[model samples]
Target: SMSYTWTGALITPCAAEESKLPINALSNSLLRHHNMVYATTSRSAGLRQKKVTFDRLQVLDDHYRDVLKEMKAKASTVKAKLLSVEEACKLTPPHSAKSKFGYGAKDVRNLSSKAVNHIHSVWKDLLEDTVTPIDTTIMAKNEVFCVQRKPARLIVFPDLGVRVCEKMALYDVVSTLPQVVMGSSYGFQYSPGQRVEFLVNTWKSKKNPMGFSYDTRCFDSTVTENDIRVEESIYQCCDLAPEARQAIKSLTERLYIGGPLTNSKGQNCGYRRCRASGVLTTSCGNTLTCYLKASAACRAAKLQDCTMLVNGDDLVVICESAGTQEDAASLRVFTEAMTRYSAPPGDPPQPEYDLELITSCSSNVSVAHDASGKRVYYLTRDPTTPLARAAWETARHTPVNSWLGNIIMYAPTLWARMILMTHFFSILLAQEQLEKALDCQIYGACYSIEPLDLPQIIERLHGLSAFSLHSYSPGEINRVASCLRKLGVPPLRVWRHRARSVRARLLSQGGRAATCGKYLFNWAVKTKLKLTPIPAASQLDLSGWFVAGYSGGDIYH
Candidate 1:
């Protein structure tokens, strides 16, 4: 008997070609009319790739040195401690891919004798075989849009054993070091509330701060061998033990610089000749190099009072804009400088006259009404993917719900608060898992999270302002409406109606359940609950996990 196995490819071959009309052809054509599909290869993309690869560039300078110095000093303060075998094993997700060494995550968590031995052997191998490049599994990631679908994006990630080793060697370093060097410029350090606040404040600080976002096409692919070595040079600045130093250097060469990419069918796809996407160093390296290049380019362009908000490859620049003509010329010089540094912009960077018009990290400032009908400004994006994932989670079990991450990231948004909260909490209540703490990842590290604690978490992360924000721009409102229609999610009014009922049910229970209902759903009720502190909130040290200092508050850690 012949059997076919799905290889995770987006397009499967059709058995025969027919001239007959295909089902949904009319709808598919209409959808394509509305969607802006970008070509995978174009003149602009080719030019950018040629410039980034062939053109020799210098991304380092005195400014780079200053930033590196500050980062190294901060790294010195961090006391790196090795994790025990059992502790490291526990950090592995229950649903992580099984190892080839005949042990799965469950076996590792249960501390089975075979699993323990295999893990120990893997670590020992890492210590001994420092020069061999580790193999990575490559897969295509399918993404959805409102109007039409696009081809899958390729993702390459290392094996589970290597990931555990990554945790032991560089997890803490990557998490803590960037915040210290970049300060508020680091993106992951701030919650949605704080990010908007920072942008608004920075915009208003100067009479005219010309803001623009720079995008580099295939940023990771553009990272050259020299760039990887330069990153290693920066990492070496930290005061590490001799063994740790050797390990870091080894990891950089064998894994970070280049590695083999293997597909699901076990075919040798090819070797990665540039920076690989899935390693502990990916975030840190990208941030470090991006800041260095942009800062140097800013100096060369002579932009006044330039302040950057950078997160890996995503960047937003706020600086004094000269007269219209002078600013235009300055931007050209800036673009030229960056191109010389091996980071050519995907599309020519355009300056935004208004700060709110600029978007970064796929999030932009939008207005919505709170409980009181006062206008509020909060971060928002098209809800196409979030709604799509919610549909999937509703029907099947998933390792982690996308809605949870969205709710945390966009806690203040009307869509997140009313719809996502209502939908997920209903599911949690049904499963009797509302009270049980579940593991979720924030900024790439795992933590045990309780749904009820979200109110306090939101407060600590975003601030009290999240509750009262209003005044969405018309453009924002239009997009929100479009997303709602495309995704078939209920309108804000319907969410409000459902929230009132959900609030009543929670208060009826009368305990932590009631508290969660009170703080989280305060917008739904007539009289708002007094904002009180959660006792456990004080004990959690989320300093490096989220952006802090916006509320003039101290991070406990």
Candidate 2:
């Protein structure tokens, strides 16, 4: 038996709003307990206990054909599949013919197909034809053999030993870097400067024990390629938290300080062009240090009372109040105006004030209270400001950020009226952005409670005319053109067919079909859609169209 000791440590559960894990350790511990039991059971099964010899695995005909089918399926669904060499590296030892041969074309194809279909292959070797089936007697003998076995030389698997050696190579490189050089590097150091070049090279040659011969000829100063020649040096400098100037200098030196070439191109000819002669040379070593330091100080000063707004597909707003209902209401009005364009059709709305009077009036006017004490309102009637409307329109036409973090509103207190106002404001603003960005009027998937008909599909499809119906998938969204072509049963119609669980719906009216763009024109007219034209200016700055500020605090623009 092996001896073991347990030490108790305070461990908290990982909690993120976007993630599914709970916040407390108790929940995580319970989950872990169940997971451990499942893992133990899964590992003991006959199929799981089998070990595959990498060299013995074969690229059989049946397996190859299956893999090809899988590749086709993945190509149709996901963006791209990994190359055979990439798959080989991930599954077997690096650069070994056995590894390459193990993950053949067919195996890769099968893996891709299985992945697209959501099938899990616990062991990569299970797909190989050479996988040997273990006999029950052999397993039984091994279980008892360990107890009675005589002393023999301890053995380490060759493949596992090689893996450890490879990992140590990476660790050795990391252990040789300088502390200060790891924390504060920035920008291309070889850009017409000698200061950064000297600092960076001196640190690399003197501080690093790793066998690196620092060279400057690898990078060209005049030819601006964004590749980082000294990535390891930058990573090291950034980790040290050095002075801003020192970081820049270190980066520059590493990028541009190697000695110039003395030899002509090999033949000693007068017109010879040497590889080292044309490379940019560095003179002074620390020029960028002062410049970088000044820039950092300037940025720090600007960030003191600053608020940053990053708006893309999603928008989040946070407000701080002095802990009052009225204060919260004021913030809500501002947020609503900034997010949702709540003005009436063709009538520009006025801006909100510190009092939040407009938001309160709009909320009451737009919503109706029910017997259950719930108030319902239309998103269009929410309060909107001219600035907010313009920002919404610009953002909708072209989203700046593809994936944006949550919109957080900071306030001093949570008041009932303020909460109500904020709730309505958030809903309306989000709806507005969604409407414009997706170009579709979305009805929550909840409408599927009953079977749908052709008329209902037309109504829903037409409803999207107001926005442009951009959110639908390629299979479904092409219906705008499909309707014009009168293609047989568009995807939306197909979905209704699935939901109703009735194939006969097509038999009654042969499904609504339109061609020659008539349906599109009618839909556009009904939705009051307008076409946007490109401006005549050669250069354009549309920053005025956005409501988000440029500083760094926590408001989503």
Candidate 3:
């Protein structure tokens, strides 16, 4: 079926748009290739549409159904609750898009009478109408990146009133159901430590290990009407209330399956027959679909003892290798099976003998040595995108700065430890905003974190060994070195000197500031301070950080 049906209307924007990277006093030192950085605009929305809009064909077999039945069994054991309208309103992001009915995120968050009344009206309407296609706004997303790619990403969503209704219906299901249904395969359930642990164990458990990461060409577009209904059926397996069941069914039919696409200027752009990127079920839906397809494809390919890790559309499979000749031939069958199932890879997957070479969730397992000269495993990736994003963050004010998230999530990586920490801390110390809480997205949920609390947070999450860790792998070292060279960032020696100066400035102040300087910047010093776990490390509540991905789910924590 066609993914989209256009009515010859153009997607329009509402604000002043900039394509070039903004020059700033701070970011200039980090990256000089300003021309390499560009923001996608409405002009490229047509190109992006061409890429995402396509006919989707899928084939299912007994293996897919077997996995489906297993998932259904686990899903049936779960019970989900319907959140109250007020509770749903509280989940909305602070700066979420405004409603067409004269209310905005502020009104919704404050639980204003108008917003609550509209929400209630929407819910009642949802219960009554089960088949009419809902209206969704189609807009080109303005995201920054480096080089080549300029097609603006598209986001489709219903009105704010109905969005609150979705939370009322499926918030708990999206939050808790994936971990129970998929268990270890659910990537968001694991922290960095758990992720590395799972990959290593899965690697060693296989005899002659062979693995590859599968990249879906366009994840959202690959979702079919049947896929959306299948996802709903899984959700329906859970014990739910009468109204909750009705709301879920209505949303699945009216909103989830397909809907009319309305431009910002109130023109009919087209219609969509695919997954909505901003829905609560987006992450769980994609995770379930990817796992199901991969599981079936593994069987069709005759791969043995397979272990899969799925995070939304990101997938990696490890299995026992049947010698080089047989393994290579089997992989082609696996690719064909996946192609038949509609998840054609962007770059076709190839079997990798080494575990560290296989990337999943855009990260690879890498090794470094802690202070005790013992091996420590950590997750890392090519720093090109992260560095480009950091430079963008440095140049302009963003609603959420991912540099903080990168530093937190990739704390043990060499680039994160040396470059991200040093560069960001220098700016924070300069502005004297170290204690101010800024928002960062981990997985998908936005978290308000203070830069000053990073030491204890890192200690609790990654362990104190992160601070004591050094002697990074030369492969990783070279990747970071090359990324710096390409992005025009200063070399490691320059960052180390900057960190030493930044460390002294922090040490002059006591408390958490001094603690940060001592532990986080220890690698830059001549004689390192003995790092130990702080008493407060165990006190922070980071439970929601790895629970689920809310990329476009409009969630804040």
Write down the lDDT that model 2 would get.
Answer: 0.20
Better of 2 and 3 by TM-score: 3
- CA lDDT of each candidate? 0.66, 0.20, 0.89
User: Candidates sorted by lDDT, descending order?
Assistant: 3, 1, 2
Among the numbered candidates, top lDDT falls to 3
Query: Per-residue lDDT tens digits of candidate 3, residues 381-475?
Result: 98888888888888787888889999899998888988899989889888898988988888888788999889988987799888988888988
Provide the lowest-lDDT 10-residue window in model 2: 136-145
lDDT tens digits, residues 365-466, model 1? 766675467766688877666665555455544455566777888887766777788777766665767887766555555556778878768778776656
Estimate TM-scores for all models.
0.80, 0.16, 0.98
lDDT, candidate 1, equals 0.66
lDDT of 2 at 15: 27
TM-score order, best first, reads: 3, 1, 2
Q: For model 3, how many clashes? A: 0
Model 3 spans > 4 angstroms off: 148-150
Stretches off by above 4 angstroms in model 2 are 1-229, 232-426, 429-528, 532-557
Question: What are the C-alpha RMSDs, in order, of all predicted structures?
Answer: 7.7, 31.1, 1.2
